[PDB]
Amino acid sequence: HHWGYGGHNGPEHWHKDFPIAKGERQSPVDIDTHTAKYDPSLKPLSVSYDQATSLRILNNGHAFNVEFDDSQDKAVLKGGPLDGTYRLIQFHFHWGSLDGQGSEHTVDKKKYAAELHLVHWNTKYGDFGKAVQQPDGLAVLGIFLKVGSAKPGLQKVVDVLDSIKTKGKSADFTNFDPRGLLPESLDYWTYPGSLTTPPLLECVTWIVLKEPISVSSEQVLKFRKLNFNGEGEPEELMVDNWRPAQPLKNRQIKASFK
Ligand SMILES: [O-]
Ligand SMILES: [Zn+2]
């Protein structure tokens, strides 16, 4: 793999190695709030993170992942549009070089400064690698970030970044509680889509929260000091690691709220 978010290997190039980039169920998308339909049939999401076990944070060269123990049903997503039970495997963010861009989903073409993705896989498929091969294999909870007041539950993440500055670096990241990254409301939009990184597999039920969380400018500044590169290599700041909105095609975005 040689894809990234640079001047020569970014989203507009991905289709050469990953032709599904131009597919029928690609993410992210712009959410036109007037066209999304309230679906009174949709349930409240069930976000069950009480028993979550965070383990490690890893700079993978494109973002940082906070990894969880997904060997048992500890931290699970159920309900909403979903059937069955989806285990949290990791979360990460997408962000910009400046506050005016960074989110992958947009809302009436509005870009947020960043977007958090909590990635979960369907336990009926047994492992993550099997799940990504199935149309109902993943459930990703998307949460927008806007810049204003600090998010206290984010600071443990921001404080560790200096220890994983470069690609391939990891640090212990036990005892982190992802419930502190949620907004107050769980109202959401949902649609069928894909991973937003190569391999771009069309295996995701997207659940995007309507209420953004507020983070401080200092918190997002610290995301922007990370590096895409490896140790000792020419410094390339980890900024603008977002794929732009893709065509909606023959899809309907459903709202949980009226
Ligand atoms: O992603
Ligand atoms: Zn993501």
Give the C-alpha separation, 239 to 98, whole Å.
9
d(CA 202, CA 20): 8
Q: CA 44: distance to chain centroid?
A: 20
Range of the domain at 199: 1-258
d(CA 236, CA 53): 32
**In whole angstroms, what is the distance from residue 229 CA to residue 239 CA?**
12
3-state SS assignment for residue 129: helix
Ligand 1 contacts CB of residue 197 (under 6 A): yes
Beta strands in 164-231 (DSSP E): 170-172, 188-193, 204-209, 213-215
State the CATH number of the domain containing residue 92.
3.10.200.10
| Nearest ligand (C-alpha, residue 140) | 2
Catalytic member of 15, 62, 105, 120: 62
**117 touches ligand 1 (CB under 6 Å):** yes
| CA 137 to ligand 1 center in whole angstroms | 15
Reduce the secondary structure of 34-70 to three states and give it as a string.
CCCEECCCCCCEEEECCCCCEEEEEECCCCEEEEECC
Instruction: Tell me whether residue 8 is annotated as binding.
Output: no
What contacts 24+ positions apart, CB below 8 Å, involve 48-55? 48/75, 48/76, 48/77, 48/78, 49/75, 49/88, 49/177, 49/178, 49/179, 50/179, 51/75, 52/88, 52/177, 52/178, 53/174, 54/173, 54/174, 54/175, 54/176, 54/177, 54/178, 55/172, 55/173, 55/174
| Annotated resolution, angstroms | 1.5
Type of residue found at 245:
A
DSSP code for 245: P
Cα–Cα nearest to 172, from 64, 67, 62, 60: 67
User: Binding site annotation covers 94?
Assistant: yes
The amino acid present at 250, given as its one-letter code, is: N
Number of H helices, E strands in the chain: 3, 15
Question: Count of residues for the chain?
Answer: 258
What is the residue type of 208?
V
Give dist(CA 42, CA 54) in Å, integer. 29
| Residue 31 contacts residue 189 (beta carbons within 8 Å) | yes
CA 114 to chain centre: 10
Q: Which 3 state secondary structure label does DSSP give 250? A: coil
Contact 187, 87 (CB under 8 A): no
CA-to-CA distance for 220 and 229, rounded, in angstroms? 19
How far, CA to CA in Å, does 110 sit from each of 102, 162, 165, 196, 224? 11, 30, 30, 18, 21
Place of tokens 């969880």: 68
- Distance, in Å, from the CA atom of 83 to the CA atom of 220, rounded to the nearest integer, reads 35
Collect all residues with Cβ–Cβ distance below 8 Å to 119 and sequence separation of at least 6: 88, 89, 90, 91, 92, 138, 140
| Number of domain units in the chain | 1
This entry's atomic model was obtained through: X-ray
CA of 92 to the centre of ligand 2 (A): 6
Greatest Cα-to-Cα distance within the chain, rounded to the nearest angstrom:
54
Does residue 62 have an active-site annotation?
yes
Q: Render 52-115 in DSSP notation, one character per residue.
A: --EEEEEE-SSSEEEEE--SSSSSEEEETT--S-EEEEEEEEEE-SSTT---SSEETTBPPSEE
Residues 6+ apart with CB under 8 A from 50: 179
Residue nearest ligand 1's atom 1 by CA: 196
Alpha carbons 102 and 209: distance in angstroms, whole number: 16
d(C-alpha 244, C-alpha 203), whole Å: 18
Distance (Å, whole) CA 139 – CA 137: 7
Asked if residue 35 belongs to a known ligand binding site, the reply is: no
